């Protein structure tokens, strides 16, 4: 007996039944006594009123050796029907397959960390195809579905043939005016700023570099133009708006190019695959494969739908 | 011998589109049948009778005619259409067979005809109506059993 | 699955995927490996990782 | 539904988009040559010209014809078709007033700097709060340089110097290390990193810069190099390149703004930045929910993965129990520990007696079973020895000094005296508990007031969140009650229970027969039980 | 690269002076003791625990990394803290369960 | 170690409002107030390096560690609330919705009189100290009004606020003791700034885009 | 239909650290507003023709205005316009064998006042609670058991509802002294921590809360003498 007990789903009940039947008495032996009255224990764990519930307990032994003496006390534990636990709190001690085996984070003990140094020596496991996440926007209001991309669907095609932090704008006072817009579209800026004040032309301002000091005073070499104070070097440079660049590209983003296309004389493109990626010097195309249907066939999917192998995509009805 | 399973078969009729039908085959050998008409028209054949009403039959199972029709796909189709033993005594291989054709979480262990799997053969014998099924070759070997 | 043009854009039918093609066309099987993502991995596997 | 309302839906949702297809001449002459039929003459203008087409010297015929050269007309292969959008013309709201103020996450961490300096550096940011009249900025420009300050950043510039310094060839080497391959958005190394450019530190979110595009990525965005080993990156999906590919272009230069600053080790992408100079926002819908990250082999715990990255918690499944009603926990750890070696120490004593001859000699503090005694090795499993049931017996050694022999000696003197006293009387001794258990139920007292004390807590922590209106629970980590399906149970509201036809079968799941078998074994006879009662209330009636 | 104790916001005074003892009534709150055990505990509330004697080291559930204490520092649980407690001597400490605010 | 120090002015004068609001209740809400908070503010930030380099966006997402805020969360909150409202009012008056801010409020609310009395409403059954704001969702791309108790801001659950109003009881009792319905309609008829709202929406349209796009006909 | 009860001292003139007109705004403002809202939400309801802490631990819309008028007058009635400075009696006992002084005490219901940032109400309160769930019963019960907390309390929240017995309150509500004066909140807790806190209210409610706690300790007993017999 103790003063502070918990509470527990198993509960032990002691049932007491009459050994024979009323009214049929047995042959009593000489050598035994018959008994009369007798009593039994039983285990039955707590049962809901809503959901029945069986007791599944099991009984292991539990000895502890102090100079080769053997404790002979079997404890015995129920199994909760829980899978899981509630909180942590509420959980129970051990959680785990083998309770020698130490590769568990949780099994291995604090102040000796050898079983959990082990565990991290471990290398990690092959599964992630090493690739990129795509996601499917189709599957996306409904169960989610994921692409893999890696460098077996991707490759890249090969050779086909200043600048820095200028500064952090500054707060205004006249706060009710455009002017936290550091620019306006051309196709948003009708919703937002009536043109009344943009009527004449040119009336908003030009790009001006206005440079403050600690101190607060507007300082640039031009009263009011275009020159940029580098950060590192704190000397004045001009960004090139126009950069003197005069590039065609002869691949746009996204274009499906199908095979013995021919780019160029030197190059033909190949993979039959959109263009994912277009560098200064590089294309990377992403694997693809073209099928030429014709008028009166059924397409089995829709657009972003993932097609496993050996799907049915287009069914033809030739005739014989 | 033929393997336990759900079996899909079509069938077209002389005049009109063509209809489709499952067949449940159980290890004593019962024959819960389902049949497409024109409409949805999702009816048994167990009866000798013209045909059988399939929300009667997952009533009886034991749905509420609200969790059926929350669980199943393509619910608009299913909404608007307005011995025991043996017949689910499915073998461990009837239960395998069933849980591929039709996607099932089922246990291997509950080897019993369960309305879950009426309703997936419902939602399919319905999808093989707009052209998303296939039908299952009876003579193919997966499909027999070895005694 | 990727089709440009002389594809219909609405199924044949109310329910399904089959789609009609009014002209000829090409269809495009852009390559990839599809995986089966539960709601749990959602969370922590995201677009471009 | 209609044709235009499908083909908007599949551009909203699936991403749909008439991407533009680079045909071969045999290609484009299938196309256009089925549409007629099947071995009849092609009358389609576009169908002959295609079958003409299907040799050189008709190509070359028509290039010579056009005029174009035969590298134009290999471009004009590459010509992008349909509606063209205007050219994008920038506007200005105003004039631009800045300031050059260090970083407020200069200091890097794990590196010292003097506090005296940095206090210096750190005073522009009260300076920085300060309003500019912009409209009137032109009267008081003045044109004369050298006279503007900025000892501050200068000194900024210079431990910075001082750290790059220090530091370029460390992170050189952590880059190869950690990532195999350049990518855009990582460090330039090895032929690429040309010196004077521009560390991480040296940026910080809401800097205006200038750059250009190197890299444009359908799915992943546009890259701009703004003078430093990381590249920026403008977020920029798949569906909106195909109106956002004629207004920016690889070679282009832009204006763009930092609006987030990250590690490039736990991110793809150090910076993200938006196009002032384009401003292309009309333009964008598909938005990141979350930035993108890398998932590396040192990673083994989703939940600091997520902690790292800001994003939710893992989500499971909502128990439907509620903390604040629920049975306290009195049970505490220590309890095992003490009680097996409470029966070591009374094993031991009462062997001690067994053997007078092995106790004398050997003092009771002092004593070893074994030298090489391990508690691993005690540990192990043994279900040879069976009487009614078979189950691995866990084996504990106890340690020798863990027990503590003397006062378990005195205990049992005194006790054994009590008894051979009580005989004398006439009378069994009892002794109701001893001294370790006392210890024990003190543990679970204590254990029991703590958790209490935390149940008392929480009422009061329930009340301020509620009237606050904070939540209760961790948001995200509880959110799925049904959505996701296909979830097996046996709740038998996805109808996963077995059929309610009259369940008789049982022999295949849930067999009762082993149970009532060995109840028949125990107990043959089956009769009314006379006195039903649990086991406590048993043993208090015994007591009262 | 970060310690664990920023990513799980769990907030630690090492080495606190005898004047902050004296406040938040540390002498006044209750103890609590244990020898060598694991304590797995869900925190529903914040717990600031004075560690006096022993040395506890906490990992958190999944994670292969633990957390040391030591017996001059002032450690507070975040809510819905998730973790196991191990212990390999005597450990005394007085804890004090807080709700929203102080 | 002090940073976020400056006081921000108002972009009106202390005494521009003084018809509706006298100068002394500004007076003593942002030099009392506000000062009090930036302070505590800085002291805060320069104890920990960690949150001393971050945005005030961030550092407010950040310190509410989603649902436990930290001890910075409470005056970063204020400063940057009170900041927000200063900036939300202007020295003009205010009964009209802007042109691009109107087709929202039709859009979802489907009136500016049902917006106003959705608005009085929320501002009214509010009990205690908080604020009231005006956002856009990123989420669902539509305008919403929300409640926040004591200092919490939508910035918490990535939302942009339009507009703001102070339902603590320093900012009105000075003027009105306890008529906070009096309170709010001179905030919704007299003190408001819609071209300030407007600005904010546009530059939040380059966060999240309230349109349609063109679908090209292929 | 409750009604608005008026304070024991003389309102206009009972304290010149609070000024009648500040008195007079506030009480009769908040007084009036909250039992009407109320009077009005609990008409013809099952709610009526109960006391205020029937519906506190009752309520829901009829909670956030019972709680305040409750706590308006307790605030009310726990101030006279004299006596303050130091408490005596048992009300020292338990103070300096809980918090260890009266100094100690009393800068603690300060600091816990202080830090209430917003609207709340700060209590002193002699803790008798009594769990419904699990092993609530203390095994080996003493004295000690029962203990002195200085707790806050966000807006419209009473430690009624958590079984705690409230014995003295500060309004720490911005009507109380923003109006009154200047608004360092410090000022006026330290002067109710001076001159308004009267003790003689909360020495009879100590004694209340000790003569519940026995009736509850004696109902306990009884129970368990049902049970033995
Ligand atoms: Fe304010
Ligand atoms: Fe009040």
């Given at each position: 007996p103790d003063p502070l007990q918990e509470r527990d789903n198993v509960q032990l009940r002691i049932v007491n039944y009459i050994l024979y039947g009323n009214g049929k008495p047995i042959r009593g032996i000489s050598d035994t006594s018959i008994q009369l009255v007798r009593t039994c224990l039983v285990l039955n764990w707590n049962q809901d009123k809503k959901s029945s519930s069986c007791e599944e307990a099991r009984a292991s032994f539990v000895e502890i050796r102090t100079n080769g003496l053997i404790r002979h006390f079997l404890r015995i534990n129920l199994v909760k029907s829980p899978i899981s636990y509630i909180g942590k709190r509420n959980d129970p001690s051990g959680s785990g397959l083998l309770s020698d085996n130490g590769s568990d984070c949780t099994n291995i003990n604090p102040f000796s960390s050898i079983y959990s140094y082990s565990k991290a020596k471990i290398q990690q496991s092959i599964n992630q195809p090493q690739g990129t996440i795509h996601t499917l926007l189709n599957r996306n209001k409904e169960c989610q579905s994921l692409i893999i991309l890696s460098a077996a669907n991707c490759s890249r095609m090969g050779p086909f043939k200043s600048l820095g932090p200028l500064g952090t704008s500054l707060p205004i006072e006249?706060?009710?005016?455009?002017?936290?817009?550091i620019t306006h579209n051309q196709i948003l800026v009708t919703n937002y700023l009536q043109l009344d004040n943009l009527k004449q032309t040119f009336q908003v301002i030009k790009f001006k570099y206005y440079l403050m000091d600690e101190n607060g005073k507007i300082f640039n070499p031009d009263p009011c133009r275009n020159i940029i104070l580098n950060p590192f070097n704190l000397n004045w440079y001009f960004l090139h708006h126009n950069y003197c660049e005069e590039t065609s590209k002869i691949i746009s983003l996204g274009q499906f190019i199908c095979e013995n296309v021919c780019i160029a004389k030197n190059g033909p493109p190949l993979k039959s695959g959109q263009v994912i990626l277009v560098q200064v010097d590089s294309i990377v195309i992403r694997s693809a494969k073209p099928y030429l249907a014709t008028p009166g066939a059924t397409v089995h999917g829709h657009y972003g739908e993932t097609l496993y192998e050996g799907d049915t995509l287009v069914t033809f009805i030739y005739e014989k | 011998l033929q393997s336990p399973g759900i079996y899909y078969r079509s069938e077209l009729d002389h005049n009109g589109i063509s209809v489709y039908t499952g067949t449940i085959i159980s290890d004593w050998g019962g024959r819960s049948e389902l049949e497409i008409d024109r409409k949805a028209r999702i009816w048994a054949r167990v009866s000798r009778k013209q045909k059988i009403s399939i929300l009667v039959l997952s009533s009886a199972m034991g749905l509420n005619l609200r969790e059926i029709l929350e669980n199943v796909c393509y619910p608009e189709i299913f909404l608007s259409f307005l011995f025991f033993q043996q017949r689910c005594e499915l073998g461990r291989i009837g239960r395998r067979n069933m849980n591929r054709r039709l996607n099932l979480d089922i246990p291997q262990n509950n080897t019993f005809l369960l309305p879950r799997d009426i309703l997936a053969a419902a939602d399919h014998l319905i999808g093989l109506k707009f052209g998303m099924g296939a039908l299952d070759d009876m003579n193919h070997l997966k499909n027999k059993r070895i005694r | 699955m990727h089709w440009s043009t002389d594809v219909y854009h609405a199924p044949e039918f109310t329910y399904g995927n089959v789609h009609l093609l009014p002209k000829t066309s090409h269809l495009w099987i852009l390559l990839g490996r599809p995986c089966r993502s539960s709601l749990v991995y959602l969370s922590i596997h995201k677009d471009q990782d | 539904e209609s044709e235009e309302e499908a083909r908007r839906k599949n551009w909203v949702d699936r991403g749909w988009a008439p991407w533009e297809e680079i045909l071969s001449p045999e290609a484009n002459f299938a196309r256009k040559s089925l549409n007629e039929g099947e071995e009849v003459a092609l009358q389609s203008p576009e169908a002959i010209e295609a079958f003409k087409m299907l040799s050189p010297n008709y190509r070359k015929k028509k290039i010579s014809d056009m005029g174009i050269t035969e590298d134009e007309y290999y471009a004009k292969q590459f010509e992008i078709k349909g509606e063209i959008p205007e050219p994008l013309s920038t506007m200005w709201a105003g004039p631009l007033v800045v300031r050059h103020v260090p970083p407020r996450d200069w200091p890097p961490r794990g590196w010292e700097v003097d506090k005296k300096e940095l206090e210096f550096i750190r005073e522009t940011h009260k300076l920085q709060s300060v309003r500019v009249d912009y409209d009137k900025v032109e009267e008081m420009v003045?044109?004369?340089?050298?006279?503007?300050?900025?000892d501050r950043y200068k000194m900024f510039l210079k431990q910075y110097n001082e750290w790059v310094a220090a530091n370029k060839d460390r992170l050189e080497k952590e880059s190869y290390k950690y990532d195999q391959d350049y990518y855009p958005g990582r460090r330039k190394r090895g032929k690429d990193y040309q010196d004077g450019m521009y560390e991480l530190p040296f940026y910080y979110p809401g800097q205006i810069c200038a750059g250009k595009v190197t890299a444009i990525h359908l799915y992943q965005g546009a890259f701009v190099d703004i003078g430093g080993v990381h590249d920026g990156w403008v977020p920029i999906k798949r569906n909106d390149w195909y109106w956002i590919r004629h207004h920016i272009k690889v070679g282009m230069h832009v204006i763009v703004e930092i609006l987030a600053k990250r590690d490039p080790y736990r991110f793809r992408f150090p910076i993200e930045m938006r196009f002032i100079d384009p401003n292309i926002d009309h333009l964008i819908f598909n938005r990141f929910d979350f930035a993108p990250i890398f998932h590396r082999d040192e990673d083994t715990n989703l939940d600091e993965l997520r902690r790292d990255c800001g994003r939710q918690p893992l989500p499971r499944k909502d128990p439907g129990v509620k903390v604040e009603e629920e049975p306290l926990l009195s049970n505490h750890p220590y309890v095992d520990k003490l009680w097996q070696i409470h029966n070591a120490e009374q094993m031991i004593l009462d062997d001690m007696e067994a053997n007078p001859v092995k106790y004398k000699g050997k003092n009771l503090t002092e004593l070893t079973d074994?030298?090489?005694?391990?508690e691993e090795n005690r540990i192990e499993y043994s279900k040879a020895y069976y009487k009614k049931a078979l189950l691995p017996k866990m084996i504990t050694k106890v340690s020798v000094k863990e027990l503590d022999l003397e006062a378990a000696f005195a205990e049992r003197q005194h006790h054994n005296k009590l008894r051979m006293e009580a005989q004398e009387r006439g009378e069994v001794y009892k002794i109701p508990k001893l001294r370790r258990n006392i210890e024990m139920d003190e543990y679970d007292f204590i254990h029991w007031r703590r958790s209490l004390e935390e149940r008392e807590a929480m009422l009061r922590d329930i009340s301020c969140r509620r009237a606050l209106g904070l939540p209760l629970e961790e948001p995200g980590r509880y959110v799925d009650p049904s959505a996701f399906g296909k979830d097996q149970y046996d709740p038998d509201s996805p109808l996963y229970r077995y059929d309610y036809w009259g369940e008789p079968k049982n022999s295949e799941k849930s067999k009762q027969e082993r149970m009532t078998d060995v109840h028949n074994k125990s107990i043959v006879g089956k009769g009314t039980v006379w006195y039903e009662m649990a086991y406590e209330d048993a043993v208090k009636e015994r007591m009262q | 690269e970060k310690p664990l104790e920023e990513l799980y916001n769990v907030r630690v005074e090492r080495n606190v002076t005898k004047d902050r003892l004296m406040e938040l009534g540390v002498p006044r709150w209750s103890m609590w003791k244990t020898g060598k055990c694991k304590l797995p505990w869900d925190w529903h509330v914040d717990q600031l625990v004075y560690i006096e004697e022993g040395e506890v080291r906490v990992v958190p559930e999944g994670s292969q990394r633990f957390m040391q204490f030591v017996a001059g520092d002032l450690v507070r649980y975040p809510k819905w803290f998730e973790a196991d407690l191990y212990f390999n001597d005597f450990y005394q400490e007085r804890y004090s369960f807080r709700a929203y605010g102080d | 170690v002090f940073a976020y120090y400056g006081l921000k002015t108002p972009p009106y004068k202390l005494d521009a409002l003084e018809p509706y609001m006298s100068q002394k209740m500004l007076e003593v809400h942002w030099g009392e107030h506000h000062r009090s908070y930036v302070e505590a503010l800085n002291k805060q930030l320069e104890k920990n390096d960690i949150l001393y380099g971050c945005t005030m966006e961030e550092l407010i997402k950040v310190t509410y560690n989603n649902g436990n805020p930290l001890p910075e969360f409470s005056d970063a909150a204020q400063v940057w609330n009170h900041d927000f409202f200063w900036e939300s009012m202007q020295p003009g008056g205010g009964d009209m919705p802007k042109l691009g801010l109107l087709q929202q409020i039709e859009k979802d609310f489907g009136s500016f009189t049902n917006f106003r009395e959705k608005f009085t409403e929320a501002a009214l059954a509010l009990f205690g100290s908080g604020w009231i704001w005006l956002v856009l969702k990123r989420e669902e791309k539509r305008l919403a009004i929300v409640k926040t108790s004591?200092?919490?801001?939508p910035l918490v659950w990535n939302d942009i606020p339009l507009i703001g109003l102070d339902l603590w009881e320093h900012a009105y009792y000075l003027d009105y003791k306890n008529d906070k319905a009096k309170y709010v309609n001179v905030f919704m008829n007299h003190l408001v700034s819609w071209d300030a709202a407007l600005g904010r929406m546009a530059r939040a349209q380059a966060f999240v885009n309230l349109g349609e796009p063109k679908i090209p006909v292929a | 239909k409750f009604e608005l009860m008026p304070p024991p001292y003389p309102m206009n003139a009972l304290e010149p650290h609070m000024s009648h007109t500040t008195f007079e705004y506030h009480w009769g403002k908040h007084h009036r507003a909250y039992v009407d809202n109320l009077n009005k939400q609990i008409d013809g309801t099952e709610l009526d023709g109960m006391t205020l802490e029937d519906i506190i631990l009752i309520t829901l819309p009829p909670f956030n205005n019972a709680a305040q008028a409750w706590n308006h007058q307790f605030f009310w009635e726990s101030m006279k316009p004299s006596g303050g400075g130091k408490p005596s009696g048992e009300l020292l006992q338990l103070i300096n064998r809980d918090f260890g002084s009266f100094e100690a005490f009393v800068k603690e219901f300060k600091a816990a006042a202080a830090t209430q940032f917003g609207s709340g109400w700060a209590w002193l309160a002699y803790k008798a609670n009594r769990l419904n769930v699990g092993n609530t019963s203390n095994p080996h019960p003493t004295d000690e058991d029962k203990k002195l907390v200085v707790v806050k309390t966000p807006n419209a929240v009473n430690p009624l509802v958590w079984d705690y017995s409230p014995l003295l309150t500060i309004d720490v509500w911005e009507h109380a002294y923003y109006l009154d004066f200047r608004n360092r909140r410090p000022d006026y807790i330290s002067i109710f921590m001076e001159k308004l806190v009267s003790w003689e209210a909360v020495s009879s409610r100590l004694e209340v809360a000790k003569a519940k706690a026995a009736e509850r300790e004696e109902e306990e007993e009884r129970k368990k003498r049902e049970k033995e017999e």
């Amino acid at each position: 007996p103790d003063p502070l007990q918990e509470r527990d789903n198993v509960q032990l009940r002691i049932v007491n039944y009459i050994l024979y039947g009323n009214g049929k008495p047995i042959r009593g032996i000489s050598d035994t006594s018959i008994q009369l009255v007798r009593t039994c224990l039983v285990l039955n764990w707590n049962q809901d009123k809503k959901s029945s519930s069986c007791e599944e307990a099991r009984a292991s032994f539990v000895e502890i050796r102090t100079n080769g003496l053997i404790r002979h006390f079997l404890r015995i534990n129920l199994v909760k029907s829980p899978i899981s636990y509630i909180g942590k709190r509420n959980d129970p001690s051990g959680s785990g397959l083998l309770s020698d085996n130490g590769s568990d984070c949780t099994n291995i003990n604090p102040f000796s960390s050898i079983y959990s140094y082990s565990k991290a020596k471990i290398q990690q496991s092959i599964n992630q195809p090493q690739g990129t996440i795509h996601t499917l926007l189709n599957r996306n209001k409904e169960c989610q579905s994921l692409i893999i991309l890696s460098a077996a669907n991707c490759s890249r095609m090969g050779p086909f043939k200043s600048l820095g932090p200028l500064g952090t704008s500054l707060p205004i006072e006249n706060f009710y005016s455009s002017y936290h817009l550091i620019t306006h579209n051309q196709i948003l800026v009708t919703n937002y700023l009536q043109l009344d004040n943009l009527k004449q032309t040119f009336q908003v301002i030009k790009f001006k570099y206005y440079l403050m000091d600690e101190n607060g005073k507007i300082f640039n070499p031009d009263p009011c133009r275009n020159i940029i104070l580098n950060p590192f070097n704190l000397n004045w440079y001009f960004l090139h708006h126009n950069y003197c660049e005069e590039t065609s590209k002869i691949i746009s983003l996204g274009q499906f190019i199908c095979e013995n296309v021919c780019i160029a004389k030197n190059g033909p493109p190949l993979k039959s695959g959109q263009v994912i990626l277009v560098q200064v010097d590089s294309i990377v195309i992403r694997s693809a494969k073209p099928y030429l249907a014709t008028p009166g066939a059924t397409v089995h999917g829709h657009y972003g739908e993932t097609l496993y192998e050996g799907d049915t995509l287009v069914t033809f009805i030739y005739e014989k | 011998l033929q393997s336990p399973g759900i079996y899909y078969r079509s069938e077209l009729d002389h005049n009109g589109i063509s209809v489709y039908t499952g067949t449940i085959i159980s290890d004593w050998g019962g024959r819960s049948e389902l049949e497409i008409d024109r409409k949805a028209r999702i009816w048994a054949r167990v009866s000798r009778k013209q045909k059988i009403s399939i929300l009667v039959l997952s009533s009886a199972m034991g749905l509420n005619l609200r969790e059926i029709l929350e669980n199943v796909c393509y619910p608009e189709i299913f909404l608007s259409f307005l011995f025991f033993q043996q017949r689910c005594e499915l073998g461990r291989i009837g239960r395998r067979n069933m849980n591929r054709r039709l996607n099932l979480d089922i246990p291997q262990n509950n080897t019993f005809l369960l309305p879950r799997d009426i309703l997936a053969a419902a939602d399919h014998l319905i999808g093989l109506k707009f052209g998303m099924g296939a039908l299952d070759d009876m003579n193919h070997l997966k499909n027999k059993r070895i005694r | 699955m990727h089709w440009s043009t002389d594809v219909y854009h609405a199924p044949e039918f109310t329910y399904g995927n089959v789609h009609l093609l009014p002209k000829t066309s090409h269809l495009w099987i852009l390559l990839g490996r599809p995986c089966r993502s539960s709601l749990v991995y959602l969370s922590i596997h995201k677009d471009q990782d | 539904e209609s044709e235009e309302e499908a083909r908007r839906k599949n551009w909203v949702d699936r991403g749909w988009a008439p991407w533009e297809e680079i045909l071969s001449p045999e290609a484009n002459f299938a196309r256009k040559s089925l549409n007629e039929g099947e071995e009849v003459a092609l009358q389609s203008p576009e169908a002959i010209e295609a079958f003409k087409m299907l040799s050189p010297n008709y190509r070359k015929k028509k290039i010579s014809d056009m005029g174009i050269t035969e590298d134009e007309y290999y471009a004009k292969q590459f010509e992008i078709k349909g509606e063209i959008p205007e050219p994008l013309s920038t506007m200005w709201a105003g004039p631009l007033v800045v300031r050059h103020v260090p970083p407020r996450d200069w200091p890097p961490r794990g590196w010292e700097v003097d506090k005296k300096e940095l206090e210096f550096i750190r005073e522009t940011h009260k300076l920085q709060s300060v309003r500019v009249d912009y409209d009137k900025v032109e009267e008081m420009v003045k044109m004369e340089t050298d006279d503007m300050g900025l000892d501050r950043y200068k000194m900024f510039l210079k431990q910075y110097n001082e750290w790059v310094a220090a530091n370029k060839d460390r992170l050189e080497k952590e880059s190869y290390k950690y990532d195999q391959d350049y990518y855009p958005g990582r460090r330039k190394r090895g032929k690429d990193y040309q010196d004077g450019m521009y560390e991480l530190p040296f940026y910080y979110p809401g800097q205006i810069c200038a750059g250009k595009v190197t890299a444009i990525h359908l799915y992943q965005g546009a890259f701009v190099d703004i003078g430093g080993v990381h590249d920026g990156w403008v977020p920029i999906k798949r569906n909106d390149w195909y109106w956002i590919r004629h207004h920016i272009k690889v070679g282009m230069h832009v204006i763009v703004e930092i609006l987030a600053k990250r590690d490039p080790y736990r991110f793809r992408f150090p910076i993200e930045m938006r196009f002032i100079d384009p401003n292309i926002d009309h333009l964008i819908f598909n938005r990141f929910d979350f930035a993108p990250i890398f998932h590396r082999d040192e990673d083994t715990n989703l939940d600091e993965l997520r902690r790292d990255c800001g994003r939710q918690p893992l989500p499971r499944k909502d128990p439907g129990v509620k903390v604040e009603e629920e049975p306290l926990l009195s049970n505490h750890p220590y309890v095992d520990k003490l009680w097996q070696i409470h029966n070591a120490e009374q094993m031991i004593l009462d062997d001690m007696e067994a053997n007078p001859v092995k106790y004398k000699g050997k003092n009771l503090t002092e004593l070893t079973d074994d030298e090489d005694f391990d508690e691993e090795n005690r540990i192990e499993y043994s279900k040879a020895y069976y009487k009614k049931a078979l189950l691995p017996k866990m084996i504990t050694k106890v340690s020798v000094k863990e027990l503590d022999l003397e006062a378990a000696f005195a205990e049992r003197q005194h006790h054994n005296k009590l008894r051979m006293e009580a005989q004398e009387r006439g009378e069994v001794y009892k002794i109701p508990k001893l001294r370790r258990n006392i210890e024990m139920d003190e543990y679970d007292f204590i254990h029991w007031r703590r958790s209490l004390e935390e149940r008392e807590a929480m009422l009061r922590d329930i009340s301020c969140r509620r009237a606050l209106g904070l939540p209760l629970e961790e948001p995200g980590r509880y959110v799925d009650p049904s959505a996701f399906g296909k979830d097996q149970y046996d709740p038998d509201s996805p109808l996963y229970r077995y059929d309610y036809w009259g369940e008789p079968k049982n022999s295949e799941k849930s067999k009762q027969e082993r149970m009532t078998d060995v109840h028949n074994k125990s107990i043959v006879g089956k009769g009314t039980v006379w006195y039903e009662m649990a086991y406590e209330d048993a043993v208090k009636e015994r007591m009262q | 690269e970060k310690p664990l104790e920023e990513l799980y916001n769990v907030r630690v005074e090492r080495n606190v002076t005898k004047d902050r003892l004296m406040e938040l009534g540390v002498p006044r709150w209750s103890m609590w003791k244990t020898g060598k055990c694991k304590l797995p505990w869900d925190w529903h509330v914040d717990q600031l625990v004075y560690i006096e004697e022993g040395e506890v080291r906490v990992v958190p559930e999944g994670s292969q990394r633990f957390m040391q204490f030591v017996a001059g520092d002032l450690v507070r649980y975040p809510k819905w803290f998730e973790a196991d407690l191990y212990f390999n001597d005597f450990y005394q400490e007085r804890y004090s369960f807080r709700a929203y605010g102080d | 170690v002090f940073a976020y120090y400056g006081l921000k002015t108002p972009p009106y004068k202390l005494d521009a409002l003084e018809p509706y609001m006298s100068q002394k209740m500004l007076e003593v809400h942002w030099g009392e107030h506000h000062r009090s908070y930036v302070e505590a503010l800085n002291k805060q930030l320069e104890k920990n390096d960690i949150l001393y380099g971050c945005t005030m966006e961030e550092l407010i997402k950040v310190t509410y560690n989603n649902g436990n805020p930290l001890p910075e969360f409470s005056d970063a909150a204020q400063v940057w609330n009170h900041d927000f409202f200063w900036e939300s009012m202007q020295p003009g008056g205010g009964d009209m919705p802007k042109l691009g801010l109107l087709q929202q409020i039709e859009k979802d609310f489907g009136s500016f009189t049902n917006f106003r009395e959705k608005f009085t409403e929320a501002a009214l059954a509010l009990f205690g100290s908080g604020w009231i704001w005006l956002v856009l969702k990123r989420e669902e791309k539509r305008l919403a009004i929300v409640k926040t108790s004591n200092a919490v801001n939508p910035l918490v659950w990535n939302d942009i606020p339009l507009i703001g109003l102070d339902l603590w009881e320093h900012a009105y009792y000075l003027d009105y003791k306890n008529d906070k319905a009096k309170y709010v309609n001179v905030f919704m008829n007299h003190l408001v700034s819609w071209d300030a709202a407007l600005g904010r929406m546009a530059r939040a349209q380059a966060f999240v885009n309230l349109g349609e796009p063109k679908i090209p006909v292929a | 239909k409750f009604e608005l009860m008026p304070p024991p001292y003389p309102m206009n003139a009972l304290e010149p650290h609070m000024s009648h007109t500040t008195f007079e705004y506030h009480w009769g403002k908040h007084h009036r507003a909250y039992v009407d809202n109320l009077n009005k939400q609990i008409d013809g309801t099952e709610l009526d023709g109960m006391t205020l802490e029937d519906i506190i631990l009752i309520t829901l819309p009829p909670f956030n205005n019972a709680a305040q008028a409750w706590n308006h007058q307790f605030f009310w009635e726990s101030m006279k316009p004299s006596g303050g400075g130091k408490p005596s009696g048992e009300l020292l006992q338990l103070i300096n064998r809980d918090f260890g002084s009266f100094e100690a005490f009393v800068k603690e219901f300060k600091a816990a006042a202080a830090t209430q940032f917003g609207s709340g109400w700060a209590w002193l309160a002699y803790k008798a609670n009594r769990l419904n769930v699990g092993n609530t019963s203390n095994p080996h019960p003493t004295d000690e058991d029962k203990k002195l907390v200085v707790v806050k309390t966000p807006n419209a929240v009473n430690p009624l509802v958590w079984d705690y017995s409230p014995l003295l309150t500060i309004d720490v509500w911005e009507h109380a002294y923003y109006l009154d004066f200047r608004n360092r909140r410090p000022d006026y807790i330290s002067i109710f921590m001076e001159k308004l806190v009267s003790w003689e209210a909360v020495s009879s409610r100590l004694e209340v809360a000790k003569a519940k706690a026995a009736e509850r300790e004696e109902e306990e007993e009884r129970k368990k003498r049902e049970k033995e017999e």
